[PDB]
Design a protein around this motif. Structure first.
Motif, PDB file in Angstrom:
ATOM      1  N   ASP A 186       6.881 -31.648  -3.347  1.00  0.00           N
ATOM      2  CA  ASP A 186       5.836 -30.657  -3.127  1.00  0.00           C
ATOM      3  C   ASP A 186       6.312 -29.476  -2.290  1.00  0.00           C
ATOM      4  OD1 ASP A 186       5.475 -32.311  -0.483  1.00  0.00           O
ATOM      5  OD2 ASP A 186       4.169 -30.586  -0.239  1.00  0.00           O
ATOM      6  N   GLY A 187       7.492 -29.566  -1.683  1.00  0.00           N
ATOM      7  CA  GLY A 187       8.032 -28.475  -0.904  1.00  0.00           C
ATOM      8  C   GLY A 187       7.350 -28.216   0.417  1.00  0.00           C
ATOM      9  N   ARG A 188       6.417 -29.078   0.832  1.00  0.00           N
ATOM     10  CA  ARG A 188       5.575 -28.813   1.994  1.00  0.00           C
ATOM     11  C   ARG A 188       5.409 -30.056   2.854  1.00  0.00           C
ATOM     12  N   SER A 189       5.159 -31.195   2.196  1.00  0.00           N
ATOM     13  CA  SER A 189       4.715 -32.413   2.874  1.00  0.00           C
ATOM     14  C   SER A 189       5.742 -32.953   3.863  1.00  0.00           C
ATOM     15  N   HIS A 190       7.023 -32.632   3.686  1.00  0.00           N
ATOM     16  CA  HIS A 190       8.046 -33.186   4.569  1.00  0.00           C
ATOM     17  C   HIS A 190       7.868 -32.730   6.011  1.00  0.00           C
ATOM     18  CE1 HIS A 190      10.091 -29.321   4.982  1.00  0.00           C
ATOM     19  NE2 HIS A 190       9.798 -29.133   3.708  1.00  0.00           N
ATOM     20  N   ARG A 191       7.036 -31.711   6.243  1.00  0.00           N
ATOM     21  CA  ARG A 191       6.979 -31.044   7.540  1.00  0.00           C
ATOM     22  C   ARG A 191       6.323 -31.943   8.586  1.00  0.00           C
ATOM     23  N   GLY A 192       6.941 -32.005   9.767  1.00  0.00           N
ATOM     24  CA  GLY A 192       6.314 -32.568  10.947  1.00  0.00           C
ATOM     25  C   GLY A 192       6.060 -34.055  10.907  1.00  0.00           C
ATOM     26  N   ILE A 193       6.788 -34.798  10.069  1.00  0.00           N
ATOM     27  CA  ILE A 193       6.512 -36.223   9.898  1.00  0.00           C
ATOM     28  C   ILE A 193       7.292 -37.109  10.856  1.00  0.00           C
ATOM     29  CG2 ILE A 193       6.107 -35.693   7.489  1.00  0.00           C
ATOM     30  CD1 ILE A 193       8.656 -37.387   6.867  1.00  0.00           C
ATOM     31  N   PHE A 194       8.321 -36.578  11.521  1.00  0.00           N
ATOM     32  CA  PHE A 194       9.172 -37.400  12.371  1.00  0.00           C
ATOM     33  C   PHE A 194       8.358 -38.175  13.396  1.00  0.00           C
ATOM     34  CE2 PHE A 194      13.469 -35.332  11.637  1.00  0.00           C
ATOM     35  CZ  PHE A 194      14.111 -36.494  11.394  1.00  0.00           C
ATOM     36  N   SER A 195       7.510 -37.475  14.149  1.00  0.00           N
ATOM     37  CA  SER A 195       6.754 -38.139  15.205  1.00  0.00           C
ATOM     38  C   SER A 195       5.997 -39.346  14.667  1.00  0.00           C
ATOM     39  CB  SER A 195       5.801 -37.145  15.873  1.00  0.00           C
ATOM     40  OG  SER A 195       4.530 -37.124  15.245  1.00  0.00           O
ATOM     41  N   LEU A 198       9.018 -42.036  13.019  1.00  0.00           N
ATOM     42  CA  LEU A 198       9.767 -42.724  14.066  1.00  0.00           C
ATOM     43  C   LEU A 198       8.861 -43.617  14.901  1.00  0.00           C
ATOM     44  CD1 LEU A 198      12.035 -39.739  15.096  1.00  0.00           C
ATOM     45  CD2 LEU A 198      12.618 -41.658  13.582  1.00  0.00           C
ATOM     46  N   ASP A 199       7.650 -43.151  15.218  1.00  0.00           N
ATOM     47  CA  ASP A 199       6.699 -44.022  15.898  1.00  0.00           C
ATOM     48  C   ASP A 199       6.444 -45.276  15.077  1.00  0.00           C
ATOM     49  N   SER A 200       6.353 -45.129  13.756  1.00  0.00           N
ATOM     50  CA  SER A 200       6.101 -46.294  12.919  1.00  0.00           C
ATOM     51  C   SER A 200       7.275 -47.258  12.969  1.00  0.00           C
ATOM     52  CB  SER A 200       5.827 -45.861  11.482  1.00  0.00           C
ATOM     53  OG  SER A 200       5.674 -47.017  10.659  1.00  0.00           O
ATOM     54  N   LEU A 201       8.494 -46.730  12.842  1.00  0.00           N
ATOM     55  CA  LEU A 201       9.679 -47.576  12.871  1.00  0.00           C
ATOM     56  C   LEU A 201       9.911 -48.144  14.261  1.00  0.00           C
ATOM     57  CD1 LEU A 201      11.993 -45.274  10.736  1.00  0.00           C
ATOM     58  CD2 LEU A 201      11.106 -47.523  10.072  1.00  0.00           C
ATOM     59  N   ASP A 210      17.307 -44.150  20.765  1.00  0.00           N
ATOM     60  CA  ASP A 210      17.432 -42.810  20.188  1.00  0.00           C
ATOM     61  C   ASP A 210      18.618 -42.080  20.813  1.00  0.00           C
ATOM     62  OD1 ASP A 210      14.968 -43.491  18.938  1.00  0.00           O
ATOM     63  OD2 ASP A 210      13.839 -42.478  20.534  1.00  0.00           O
ATOM     64  N   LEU A 211      19.461 -41.481  19.980  1.00  0.00           N
ATOM     65  CA  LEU A 211      20.631 -40.736  20.429  1.00  0.00           C
ATOM     66  C   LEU A 211      20.397 -39.248  20.327  1.00  0.00           C
ATOM     67  CD1 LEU A 211      23.341 -42.898  18.657  1.00  0.00           C
ATOM     68  CD2 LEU A 211      22.949 -42.749  21.140  1.00  0.00           C
ATOM     69  N   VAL A 212      19.849 -38.820  19.197  1.00  0.00           N
ATOM     70  CA  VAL A 212      19.533 -37.421  18.925  1.00  0.00           C
ATOM     71  C   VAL A 212      18.174 -37.385  18.240  1.00  0.00           C
ATOM     72  CG1 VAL A 212      20.133 -35.522  17.363  1.00  0.00           C
ATOM     73  CG2 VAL A 212      21.938 -36.624  18.837  1.00  0.00           C
ATOM     74  N   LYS A 213      17.284 -36.497  18.704  1.00  0.00           N
ATOM     75  CA  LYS A 213      15.918 -36.365  18.179  1.00  0.00           C
ATOM     76  C   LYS A 213      15.638 -34.885  17.972  1.00  0.00           C
ATOM     77  N   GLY A 214      16.183 -34.333  16.901  1.00  0.00           N
ATOM     78  CA  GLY A 214      15.951 -32.945  16.573  1.00  0.00           C
ATOM     79  C   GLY A 214      14.811 -32.748  15.590  1.00  0.00           C
ATOM     80  N   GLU A 215      14.553 -31.468  15.290  1.00  0.00           N
ATOM     81  CA  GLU A 215      13.442 -31.142  14.405  1.00  0.00           C
ATOM     82  C   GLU A 215      13.731 -31.592  12.976  1.00  0.00           C
ATOM     83  N   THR A 216      14.998 -31.611  12.580  1.00  0.00           N
ATOM     84  CA  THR A 216      15.344 -32.032  11.240  1.00  0.00           C
ATOM     85  C   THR A 216      16.215 -33.274  11.186  1.00  0.00           C
ATOM     86  OG1 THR A 216      17.442 -30.878  10.825  1.00  0.00           O
ATOM     87  CG2 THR A 216      15.434 -29.572  10.791  1.00  0.00           C
ATOM     88  N   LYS A 217      16.957 -33.618  12.240  1.00  0.00           N
ATOM     89  CA  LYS A 217      17.733 -34.845  12.170  1.00  0.00           C
ATOM     90  C   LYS A 217      17.530 -35.756  13.364  1.00  0.00           C
ATOM     91  CE  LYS A 217      22.530 -33.729  12.979  1.00  0.00           C
ATOM     92  NZ  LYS A 217      23.574 -33.200  12.066  1.00  0.00           N
TER      93      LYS A 217
END
Ligand SMILES: Cc1cn([C@H]2C[C@H](O)[C@@H](CO[P@](=O)(S)OP(=O)(O)OP(=O)(O)O)O2)c(=O)[nH]c1=O
Ligand SMILES: [Ca+2]
Ligand code: NA
Ligand code: NA
Ligand code: NA
Ligand code: NA
Length: 310
Positions: A186-195, A198-201, A210-217
């Motif tokens: 969809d080109g959109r839905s991937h946004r902002g899902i980390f929080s 990662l909370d789920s996992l 956690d070693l690195v927690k960036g906006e994309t990786k």
DNA sequence: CGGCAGTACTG
DNA sequence: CAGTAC
DNA sequence: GCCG
């Protein structure tokens, strides 16, 4: 490998230069070693050696000494610091500069590091998992890890696409860590899902550090449940669908393959990254819906992941 | 002589 | 930024 | 270390 009696010696020097920080000399060695592993027959003559791309006068001189001698004398003069520098730089988060600093300060063992060294947050996690992060996992375990991330991701949006890359996608029997690439058509839905992801996992107990927690990786540490499990390195990258082909290419590797493709791209006035294949100079992003399109725009035949294992 | 891949993250 | 890593 |  026709030339193991050669490369086994050269790899010791390569590692020695690497841990001492001589980046570029180490690279030259690394390339000659693979060039040597990729010749059909054993190297027989000095002029046979220069024939190989990546082998010059200095390297051919060392290969002849090895054949006439069975040995390379420079191995006898490697500094006594090298095994300690290797020990220290095998801590995730500590490289050559940290290792050399710890050595100058008098540290000689991981007990010295544990008890007296100043560690960054990352390095403390690396040290706690020192043995585990030196071990590779069977690819069947990488599959369980990929599926664990995919199930947690698809629970919040079933449209999310999740693909394990790195050595796993190249088909290796063992994997040093797991590389999960996430996007959404969809080109959109991937946004902002980390929080959330990662909370789920983390809420599971699967993610342990956690070693690195960036906006994309995200780079971190996980462990599947049950007995007999080790802690494993896990990387998760979330990208827009527009970038999926170049992200897949990058993340599947190998590293030497990526460096080689990127170097080629630059000779042609282009630039290749995990974001895009561009014209160089800004430049223009070229449309790359598939990995095959990246290869085609670089004028090369498509290679499946298994034949990128350089 | 000088590049050797390009980018992300940490503090 | 320098260091480190993918 | 190699190579353009
Ligand atoms: C080190 C490094 C990597 N990469 C890319 C290609 C790698 O494929 C991918 C994942 O990185 P890794 O997990 S370290 O590597 P692999 O899965 O290939 O192999 P193992 O983990 O089993 O050892 O990122 C890169 O562009 N420049 C680099 O300098
Ligand atoms: Ca990997
Ligand atoms: Na040559
Ligand atoms: Na390290
Ligand atoms: Na002391
Ligand atoms: Na990785």
């Amino acid at each position: 490998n026709h030339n193991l009696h050669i490369t086994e010696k050269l790899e010791v020097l390569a590692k020695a230069y690497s841990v001492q920080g001589d980046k570029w000399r180490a690279l030259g060695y690394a390339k000659a070693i693979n060039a040597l592993k990729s010749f059909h027959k054993p190297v027989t003559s000095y002029q046979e050696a220069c024939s190989i791309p990546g082998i010059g006068k200095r390297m051919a001189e060392k290969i002849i000494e090895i054949l006439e001698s069975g040995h390379l004398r420079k191995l006898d003069h490697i500094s006594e610091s090298v095994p300690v520098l290797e020990l220290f730089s095998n801590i995730w988060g500590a490289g050559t500069k940290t290792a050399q600093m710890w050595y100058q300060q008098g540290f000689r063992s991981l007990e010295d590091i544990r008890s007296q060294a100043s560690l960054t947050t990352q390095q403390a996690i690396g040290l706690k998992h020192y043995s585990d992060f030196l071990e590779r996992m069977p690819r069947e375990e990488a599959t369980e890890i990929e599926q664990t991330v995919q199930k947690a991701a698809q629970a919040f949006n079933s449209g999310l696409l999740c693909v394990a890359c790195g050595s796993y996608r190249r088909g290796k029997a063992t994997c040093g860590d797991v590389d999960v690439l996430i996007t959404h058509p969809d080109g959109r839905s991937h946004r902002g899902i980390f929080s959330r992801l990662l909370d789920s996992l983390r809420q599971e107990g699967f993610l342990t550090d956690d070693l690195v927690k960036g906006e994309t990786k995200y780079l971190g540490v996980c462990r599947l449940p049950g007995p007999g499990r080790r802690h494993r390195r896990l990387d998760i990258i979330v990208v827009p669908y527009s970038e999926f082909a170049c992200a897949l290419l990058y993340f599947t590797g190998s590293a030497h393959f990526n460096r080689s493709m990127r170097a080629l791209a630059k000779t042609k006035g282009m630039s290749l990254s995990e974001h895009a294949l561009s014209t160089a100079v800004p430049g223009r992003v070229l449309p790359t819906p598939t990995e095959k399109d990246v290869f085609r725009l670089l004028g090369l035949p498509y290679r499946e992941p298994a034949e990128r294992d350089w």
